[PDB]
Symmetry: D2
Subunit: 329 residues, 4 copies
């Protein structure tokens, strides 16, 4: 029997400091989206969380670099619960085909609260129409994924979220559908949704003004300067923000997780050469590099493969050093 | 504030005859998807419904042709309520039934259910696009075939939605022409799913679906059209490769028509030719048709579409004879 | 599957006139309760409603008397559905509207709202007894006066209920003549309460009520009757002592009539006599009345109670003329 | 405000294997006493109202030793009453206002209620309560082994309906002025099937079809005069037989049978003891208002002392419990 959001919000209410972090981080991000601050948002963390222990451990380390680089970068953890394909730690938290959604949603809120409490903001992918209410309050940045950027109900969903939202270009490279997504997400909508209490209702939303585009490759990779400058023109054409995010992983690195660093080197070049239209990057990253089918090694992905801790330090310093130079000019 | 499904199911319960017409039409379609019957499913009617009255006059006309071509074609009306916009605009009758930015969703939901009931009661089965996660509980019982649009075919929740529907479901290929996503949608929709949904009583719940065995593909065009025998033949091999039904539907409108209503006949004509040489992979087609041809920004003229432009009634009578005769021959073999 | 109140409200919303009649009848009763108007509230009508048709006819007749005597009396119809049993039996038109043990509650409630709306539209305000905690929401907007019966006057949850009702409320003395429990009840109902209740949408919620200032006591006999002037005077003294309105209602039926429907006229004769004398603490009366007199175990004769025995329509004209005239005199002084 | 449904508390505080076994077993043992199949004496005993779990848990440990020591003469069950009926107004109890300060934090209160009950059952002490609200019972009824319908609600159809659908035995009190018929009638109604509106474990209103509660009985709790003595019991037993219902009954030592004097509960007890020695075949149980510390107070200043009706203290409780055990050992011999 499905518990409503209110049951989880009661056991695990947001603390003052988690509340303050989220509010502050959401704003700080807004500033990057509309070009009021020249720091670089870095959404970095695992492809997917399957072990809360590990995620917290990962946070601790990320925390040191988050504060270390705070004048140049704005580091925020990837806390994605799954990959649209095990459909997650939400849909199946025991990793054994048991589908215990009540436990999953509880565990997800708990991890989210714990990270916000220790100073680490959290981002995630909003896939379902109903699950967001259970932890959206703990989320500082949200992704609508390549497979739903074109869906009306997902643009609706984003139009009512209190955090900035990144729309990915379509699976085969289509950029218009993300630009459209911003236009749709920015305006008011009326639609059916589910309340904190678990009842259906008509919601009226006010529009999300802090949406932006995410370049994640396609038929070919769209991360370089020319690809970025073409994106910027199109965004200016449609009267939406020409500041965008580049996903280092997935279809931009193709089938090689270690190529994340090359893309990052290339973004670093742009930032030292000009890079005016870049406000963020995304990186798939974990304690231990690579992937595995079943979860036997601690802190190594069971979905898409991720760079390991060593390379993450490397990749962050690379970008930190690069963006310091852009902020100077 | 929102009325639950059960409220509409109490005012507008399904009749003995609607129920059988639906059970019957669904089964009849499954057989088309599984090649047990080689009639041609013809999903035909307006782009979107803005006026129940005109849709009831339309249906009465189209029913005469349903009875007349029943050995050759299986005709089912297009009764589209929810509309996917590219950016924005009127999202359909459910979302905004007074056409004036009021968003009287309870009224809209009642109107749609009543129209669909009236249609089954007169003997015209109905088809719609399932776009929202929640609205289907209000009138799925009246639906003989549903579609998942080009824009939502890649979505996991729409796939799960399909997997719990009792009617056959057609997935369209994506807006650029990508066909893999719809092949993948059949894969997923055919399996059992656990996900979150809403009950008849208006509450969120866990639902464990049995999976929908009667799903199929719809070719509706992309960067360039995809209706001809060659494109049909490439798709067919891909379907057999993935080990799912190689029977598919071809849409004559949208990207296959280059968004022009005077090309829909052209497409139907290439389909008739295919049907006459062979075309054993074609189990159905789709056509945007209204009492009157074209479109209009505002609902001024009766029976004229305010969304995509449609062919008129005269042009519809032709298109149907065209396919009726072309398919009789195929069935003769 | 129980439909929420919003479903019934959507189908039978209140009309401008029904709303005005309720609003204004409620205020007129408040006046009578707080001694600002010396007309006599008369709560008259069948013991229980088992036939809406016969109900609507009774109103028509009663409507002509409501206006004739509008200057002396304020006539409001007894439209009780929900009936408390000593043990068990037919609990009412809500709980079992088909009279056959089918317990079709959704239909019952729809029928109850429908009758109430009609009665109001044609100009006859309605009164009822609130027994259940959940069913009030379905039609309380159509109710001008409410009763908490003798068996629940001492119940804390019914006192809480009463604290949130927007219409005046009569508490009866307890089944063996205890009056204190009713005086207490007004104490409770007059205050703010916090408790669990159910919303217009069918969900449990915490409600906070502001208190009902228009409560009063009803004298309905015990082991011995309590209608006469001495008991009336004895009651007023008790009221004034606990700091509540000393304006009360007297039941002419039940333990005051010794469960004999003929004795209802005896009691009204005594009230009439008190009104001619002085009787300044009487603000209303109750009468169990129907088109046809007496009772039956099964609904065979039209307009004849199947519960407690009522006076016929003949005896009604007589009892109203009698009270109308006696109170015209009191009003003169 | 935002009431959590029973499923929320049921999920945080699921009934345990042991609690569940104790509830099933006590409910059955009680049914036996109601229907003249066992001669032990059911003893409902504990504070008038719970205003502090800690004290309630300390109380229970003590009473557990005596439940055990007297298990072959008495069946002991703690009074864990949350909801209270005021004559007019007042604190309605720990559920309705758990911080004691006018805050009506009912979500906290229900979680507190469930936690206490669960802990009580987990430690081997079954629990009884009065069911006053239509909606609260769903939050912890599963942890209750015996229930009470109060004197002020025994004549109410919806409290009879409620009772008809409880899985535990129920005792209906006689009316505040001594009316016994209303309670005999109430067993009548409660033993039959009803259809009525209630609220689900998930928080929605629903139609419920109840099966009937066959283990209802009467409680003599006084009226204008007390009704505990032999003469009153036998006259009650005749009225019960007359109406076709069980002539086994419970006698409340407190409230109108002790005329609101906590020191007379022992006198009542003594009278009951005699009747168990003389014959007493219609008695199946007793109720006592007991606490760690005797008397009462308007504010929860002293620990283990009632803020509602006055209770006898631990000492008098040890005394009263031995007296009854002794006297019932003898009745069980015959
Ligand atoms: Mn990934
Ligand atoms: Mn269209
Ligand atoms: Mn009556
Ligand atoms: Mn007490």
């Amino acid at each position: 029997e499905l518990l409503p959001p209110i049951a989880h919000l009661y056991e695990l209410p947001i603390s003052k400091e988690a509340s303050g972090l989220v509010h502050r981080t959401r704003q700080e991000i807004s500033d990057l989206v509309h070009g009021r601050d020249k720091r670089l948002l870095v959404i970095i963390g695992p492809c997917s969380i399957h072990d809360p222990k590990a995620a917290l451990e990962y946070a601790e380390r990320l925390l040191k670099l988050r504060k270390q680089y705070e004048n140049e970068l704005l580091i925020v953890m990837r806390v994605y619960f799954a990959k649209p394909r095990w459909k997650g730690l939400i849909n199946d938290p025991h990793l054994d085909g048991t589908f215990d959604i009540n436990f999953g949603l509880r565990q997800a809120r708990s991890l989210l609260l714990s990270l916000n409490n220790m100073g680490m903001p959290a981002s995630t992918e909003f896939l379902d129409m109903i699950t967001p209410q259970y932890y959206a309050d703990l989320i500082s940045w949200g992704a609508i994924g390549a497979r739903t950027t074109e869906s009306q109900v997902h643009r609706e969903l984003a139009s009512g979220l209190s955090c900035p939202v990144g729309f990915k270009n379509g699976t085969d490279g289509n950029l218009k559908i993300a630009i459209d997504a911003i236009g749709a997400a920015s305006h008011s909508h009326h639609f059916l949704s589910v309340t904190k209490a678990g009842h259906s209702a008509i919601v009226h939303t006010g529009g999300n003004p802090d949406c932006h585009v995410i370049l994640r490759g396609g038929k070919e990779p769209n991360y370089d300067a020319e690809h970025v400058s073409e994106a910027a023109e199109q965004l200016r054409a449609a009267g939406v923000t020409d500041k965008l995010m580049i996903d280092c992983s997935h279809a931009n690195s193709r089938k090689d997780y270690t190529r994340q660093m090359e893309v990052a080197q290339d973004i670093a070049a742009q930032l030292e050469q000009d890079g005016g239209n870049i406000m963020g990057v995304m990186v798939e990253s974990h304690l231990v590099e690579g992937r595995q089918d079943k979860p036997e090694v601690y802190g190594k992905s069971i979905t898409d493969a991720c760079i390991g801790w060593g390379a993450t330090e490397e990749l962050l310093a690379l970008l930190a050093g690069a963006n310091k130079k852009r902020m100077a000019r």
